[PDB]
Structure formats: structure tokens, C-alpha cells
Amino acid sequence: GTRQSPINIQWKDSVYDPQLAPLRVSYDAASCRYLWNTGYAFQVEFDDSCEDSGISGGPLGNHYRLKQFHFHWGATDEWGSEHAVDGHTYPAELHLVHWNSTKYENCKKASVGENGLAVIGVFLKLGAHHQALQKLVDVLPEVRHKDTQVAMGPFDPSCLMPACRDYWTYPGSLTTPPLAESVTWIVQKTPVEVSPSQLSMFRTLLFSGRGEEEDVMVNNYRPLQPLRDRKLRSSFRL
Ligand SMILES: [K+]
Ligand SMILES: [Zn+2]
């Protein structure tokens, strides 16, 4: 593929696009359903029945419905994020996945189709405790094994995003099989602070299933891929 993700977001390749319309983010917290261990990461699933929960504007042709969000992290605080910024890797990265409900019938089909997905990437860095994230951390002990799940109460994913919403956008792909190049990436420039214990709890999950030899879930990120001739745009002046 020539549009693979993640990438090292570099100043030299960035071009400011002042024409980008305001990115509108509005989720229905009441649509949250459960959290589960996918065998690769932990993920929060939503009921994407309504079309009033997701994002629009920015580099998107229309509204994309929120389906789920998940995290990627490392064995220690020194690495873990998928994308890098001018060579710098963060301890973890949050991915909010939305699908094109205008061009596609459902997430599944949109996930492998052109312009099927819009994924927001958020970097997590060490700092102050993050209250919203803690609601998720609290139940991680319930989903240690692969495929296990736990019910979720309402949860607004916007609470996991930085106040400053500057972002970079580029056409990319999924970072897990089938690695389809169906994603319009929106990577937030401003990392979000989380306490040391929150990242430590991420590392208590397992890749392995119940009754199997424990295989610790860490370093669940894909290595950096070349930008190639892709257009990397910034929503903010460089
Ligand atoms: K399950
Ligand atoms: Zn991801």
C-alpha cells in the first residue's frame, strides 16, 4: 500500500490548509454500551443507531458516526503511541473510529471502503490524573483476558480529547488487519495528560485467553510507515 498508517508527522511535510471548515465533534454519551479486551487492545463500543453521534466538518464530506474507540500503548512510559510527531513517540495513543454513514451501509463495509472511516488520534502523555479516562481504567481488572467484556454506563468520548483541538489530517489506513486504506486520519496535536497509574493499568491486560499461559498486553502498536507522496495538512498555522 502507498497510504499506510501510522506515520511520523513531520514539520517538513506539513502544509497549512486554512480552508478546513471547523471540525464538529458531538457524541451521545448515552449510546455507550460496553468495554472489551479485543485480544490486541481494549475497546469501548457504542450503539451507532442514531446519526446524531459522531463528527463532521474539517476534511470530511459529511457526518461520520461514532462506532468505537480504543488504545495503543507500550511496555513502559517511554514509547507506545502509533504516530510520532517529529520523531517523538508518546506513551499511548487513543483512536476514536467513526464511519461514513452517507457513503456506506455500515461500519463493517465502510472499514474496507474508500473514504469509509474517519479516525481521530489522541496522544496520551504523563501528567495530571484524567478523570474521564479513570472511569474506563476502573473496570480494566474485569477484562484482563482476551474477549472478555463488561457493561458501560454513559460515556462521552469528547472528555478524552484535549481542549486545544488543532490537528493534522492525511489519507491513511487501519493499523490492524486488513490494513485497508479507508481512513481519513485526524490526529490531534495536543497530547492529553494521564497519571502514571492509568498507563500502568493498561499494562495489566493480557493478549491471552482464560486458562492460557499469560501473555502480557503491551506494545500493541504498528511501526511507522512512510508518508510517500501523500498530502499532510495542518488545521493550524505552522
Ligand atoms: K466476550
Ligand atoms: Zn487504533
What distance in Å separates the CA atoms of residue 83 and residue 122, rounded to the nearest whole number?
A: 10
95 annotated as belonging to a binding site for a ligand: yes
Domains of the chain: 1-238 (3.10.200.10)
State the SS3 of the chain. CCCCCCCEECHHHEEECCCCEEEEEECCHHHEEEEEECCCCEEEEECCCCCCCEEEEECCCCCEEEEEEEEEECCCCCCCCCCEECCECCCEEEEEEEEECCCCCCHHHHCCCCCCEEEEEEEEEECCCCHHHHHHHCCHHHCCCCCCEEECCCCCHHHHCCCCCCEEEEEECCCCCCCCCCEEEEEECCCEEECHHHHHHHCCCECCCCCCCCCECCCCCCCCCCCCCCCEEECCCC
> Cα-flanking dihedrals φ and ψ of residue 201, to 5°?
-65, -35
Resolution of the experimental structure, in angstroms: 1.9
Taking the CA of 37 as reference, the closest ligand is: 1
| C-alpha 44 to ligand 1 mean position (Å) | 13
Residue 79's closest CA among 69, 64, 93?
Answer: 93
Question: How many angstroms separate the alpha carbon of residue 192 from the centre of ligand 1?
Answer: 30
Q: How far apart are CA 203 and CA 200, in angstroms?
A: 5
Q: Which ligand is located closest to the Cα atom of residue 149?
A: 1
Q: How was this structure determined?
A: X-ray
Return all residues near 110 (Cβ < 8 A) that are at least 6 apart.
99, 100, 101, 103, 104, 116, 117, 182
Residue 238 C-alpha to ligand 2 middle, in angstroms? Answer: 26
The bound ligand whose nearest atom lies closest to the alpha carbon of 222 is 2
Measured in angstroms, how far is the CA atom of residue 164 from the centroid of ligand 2? 21
Shortest-distance ligand to the CA of residue 96 = 2
CA distance 134 to 83: 23
Q: State the distance from the centre of ligand 1 to the C-alpha of 84, rounded, in angstroms.
A: 32
Which among 229, 45, 234, 48 is positioned nearest to 155, based on CA atoms?
Answer: 45
Read off φ and ψ for residue 180, nearest 5 degrees. Answer: -70, 145
Which ligand is nearest the CA of 95, by number?
Answer: 2
Residue 225 CA to ligand 1 centre (angstroms): 32
Cα 146 to ligand 1 centre (Å):
8
